[model samples]
Target: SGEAPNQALLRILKETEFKKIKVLGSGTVYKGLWIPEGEKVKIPVAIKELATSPKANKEILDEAYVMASVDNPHVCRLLGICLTSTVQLITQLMPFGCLLDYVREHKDNIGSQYLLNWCVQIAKGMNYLEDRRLVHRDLAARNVLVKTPQHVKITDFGLAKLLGAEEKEYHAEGGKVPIKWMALESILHRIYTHQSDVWSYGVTVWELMTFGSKPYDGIPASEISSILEKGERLPQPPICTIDVYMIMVKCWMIDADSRPKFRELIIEFSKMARDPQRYLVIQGDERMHLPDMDDVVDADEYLI
Candidate 1:
C-alpha cells in the first residue's frame, strides 16, 4: 500500500524533474507514478525493452512511460525513462484520459455533439500517426488519451510498430491482444497493417458515438472471428445513421487492403463532426436500429 520511500527514488525523480507522486495500480501491476513540476498532473512512467542485437535475451523487458505536460510533437517520441521491459505505465490522473469510457460515463450531460468533437480530435491524432507510416496497432478508445477538448494524444505504443521498407511486420507473441477492438483481418490473420488499424479506428469511432459501447459486445470473440474470416463484420449501431454506419463498414471491410487510409478517415469524420446532420439522416421510425448484440461489455471488464 506504500511506495518505496527510498531516497534513491527521490534522487532519480528529482534529477528527472518528476515532482508530485501518485499511486496508480492495476491488479498486480504497481506502476511507478510521477507528476509535472508545478501542476498536480500525474502520468505513468512507461518502460520499453530495447535490443542492442537480435541475439540479446531482451535484457530489459520492463520499461516506463515518461513525458512532460508539453504538447506532443505530432509524432511518437520516447519519454526520458528507460528499462529492460517494454512495459508502459499510465496514471489515471490525466484530465482527458481514456476518451472512450470517460465520454460514456459523462455523455448524458455532455451531449452527443460535444462527444463528436472529441472523437474528431482523436481521429486527427490517428491521422498524424498514419501519415508517419505508423500503425497504432491498437486503436481502441482506451488508447486515445485527452489533454483537453481540442487536444488528444494517441497513447499505448507498446502494441505499436512502424511500417515501411525498413520496418518488418511484427507478430505480437503474448495473448494480450484487445480482441473486441481488433479488425476482422487482424483477428483472422495475424497482421498489423494500416487498414487493420483503420478497422479498429472504426470501432473506436463507434465507441465515441455510442458513449463507450464495445464494438461487438454480445458476440463472442470466436463467433466474431468466424464472421470476420467469412468477410462479414459487426453490424452497425442503429444510432449511427447510414453514412456514419457506412463509414464504420468501410473500416471493417473484409479485405484489409480495401480499408480507407487514415487521411480519408480524417476527412470523412471531420466533416461528420462538423455537420453531423449532413451525414446522419434518419427516416421516421428508424431510430431503434441497435446491433443484434448491442449490449456492451461489463463495466468492470476494462475500467480501472
Candidate 2:
C-alpha cells in the first residue's frame, strides 16, 4: 500500500534533512545533494519542492502516489516527502546524472553494445509501467537517469497518468508538451496513451544514437505537426544500424496501433543487446571491427 501524503511528509521530516546542491541542469524541477548530519558518511538524495497552495499540494501528492505505486529496479524509487515550512519530495540520487548528459559526454568513446544495452534497460522500465497501465506522457532520454554506465532508471513522473478500461486515451488539459517527442495522435488530438510513450521512446532511441542531439533539430516546434502530417520523420542517426533504425521507424508509424508495444520492444531490444554484431551494418567495403576498451580513452568517465 502507498503511504498517505501527509504521513509521508511527516516521516521525511523526522528522518532526514536535505541539503541543496547546484541546480540540476536541463529543465529539471528538483535540486539536492549529499548531506552528513552527524556521521562521516553522507546520504544522497534529490528534493523537489512543491508549492504550498492546496491545488499544488494535491498535484504533487498525486505524482507521489504514482511513484509510490511502482517498485521496479528500472524505475526511480521515491524515498519520502517533506512538508515543514514547504513541501518537498525526496528520491534516491542517481550518481551518473541523466542519460542525455551522459551520452553526450561519452558518445564517441562508448561502444555500440553499451548504448544498445541502455536502450534495453529503458525498454524494461517502460514495459513495467505499461504492465501497470501507467502512461508516462513525457518519456525522453532526459527523464532517464544513469545509475551506472550500463544501467539507467526512469524518473520525472510529473506528467504521468493512469490508464483504465474506458480511458484508453487522455486529453491534454493544457501544459507544455515536448512537441518533437510527441506522437502524431498526441500532437493532433491531444490524446495520450502508452503508444504515445512508445513514440517518445523511439525519439529517445534517436537521442542515444545521435549522442543527445535535439530531436527534429532545425525545425520550429510550430512546423512539427505539419511536417509529421506530411509523413516525414527524423533521419536515421549515423551511428544507428539498419535494424535499430527500423525499430525506431516502426515506433514512429503514423497509426498508433502500428507501433510496437513495450513488451515487444523489450524482446527486440534484448535480442539486439545480446547479439549486437548481427544487427550492426557497416558502411563501405571494409569490414568493421569493434573498438577495444584500451583504444577508447576515458571510457569509464561516464560510469560515475
Candidate 3:
C-alpha cells in the first residue's frame, strides 16, 4: 500500500551529514538548503523535510509520487528525496525565494506586466496539474516559488491528489485550512476541486496586485464565509486595472461551475502580457499606482 511503481525512488542520506541553511518561513513542511558532504564544489539544493510517522509517511509517499509525475517548467521539479530519521524532499534551489516575499520586496520597482507574467506562470503550472487530473488542494502566492525575477514555479504539493471523474471534490479528514483563499464550496462542504484551486488563484492574483497584502485584511477568518455569502468580495487593489479585476471577479463566482479553467486564465493573462499598455490605459482621471515605496516593511513579516 505504500510504494507505487511509478513513484520516484529517493536516495537515503545519513541524517548527520546534511547541513541546514535557513528554514523556509511558512508551512508545516520545513525547507532549507542541503549541502551534501564531500562535495568541494558545494552544490546547494533545497530540502523540504517533514516529521515522519506511520500515517504521515504514506501521505509523503503520495506527495512524492505526484511530484515525480509532474514535469512542467512552471512546476518545481523534484530531484530526489532523502530517507533518514525524517523525510527529506529535495529539489532545485530557488534563489529569489517565495513569490509572497518577492512581490512585497520588489512591487514598487516591478511593472504590472511582470507581475502578470508571474500570474501566467502559476496558471500554466496549475493547468498542467488540472490536465493530469491532479487537484492542488492548496494554491496561493505563498506556495509559489520565484526561480528568477521573471520565472516562477508552483511548489507545495503536500495535499495534491488525483481524482476520478465522479470524484470532482475531496474531503479532508481534518487540518488547518487557508480560509480566505478557499472557495465557498470547499469551505462549506469540505470539498476540493481544480475549480476551488482556481478560486484560490484569483486571491493569489489579488495578492500580486496588492504586493502580498493579506486577503480580507480587516475581516477575521470566522467572518469570511458569511461575508462572502452576503456577496461581499475583497476590494480591488489600487494598482489593479479594471480588466484584471474583472478576471478576478470571474474566478470568484459563487458557483464553482462558473469559474474559468486555468487554461482560460492562461489565455487571458497571455493577452494582457502581450498588450499591457492597452490594459494599462486609464480613463476618467483614474491613475495607476504602485505599492507605497516609502514603507520599509519586512517581507518575511507577511507570511501566510
Model 3 reaches what TM-score against the true structure? 0.81
Models sorted by TM-score, best on top: 2, 3, 1
Question: What is the C-alpha local distance difference test score of each model?
Answer: 0.56, 0.77, 0.78
Candidate 2 lDDT, 1-304, residue by residue in tens: 3422323232354334666675664313456654546667666777776436767777787778878777788998887777666667778888788989887886556666777778877888898888777899999999999877767999989889877745787887777898999998888889999999999999999998888899877889999999999989989888677889999999999888999988777767766766666655334313323222322323221121
Q: What TM-score against the true fold does each predicted structure earn?
A: 0.67, 0.82, 0.81
lDDT of 1 at 196: 78
C-alpha lDDT (0 to 100) for residue 202 of candidate 3: 94
Q: Quote the positional error of residue 301 for candidate 1 in Å.
A: 36
Candidate 1 at 128: error in angstroms? 2.3
The number of clashing residue pairs in each candidate reads: 21, 0, 0
Error of model 2, residue 137, in angstroms: 0.4
List candidate 3 segments past 4 Å from native.
1-43, 51-58, 280-304
Greater TM-score among 1 and 2 belongs to 2
Q: State, as a TM-score between 0 and 1, how close model 2 is to the true structure.
A: 0.82
Q: What is the alpha-carbon lDDT of model 1 when measured against the actual structure?
A: 0.56
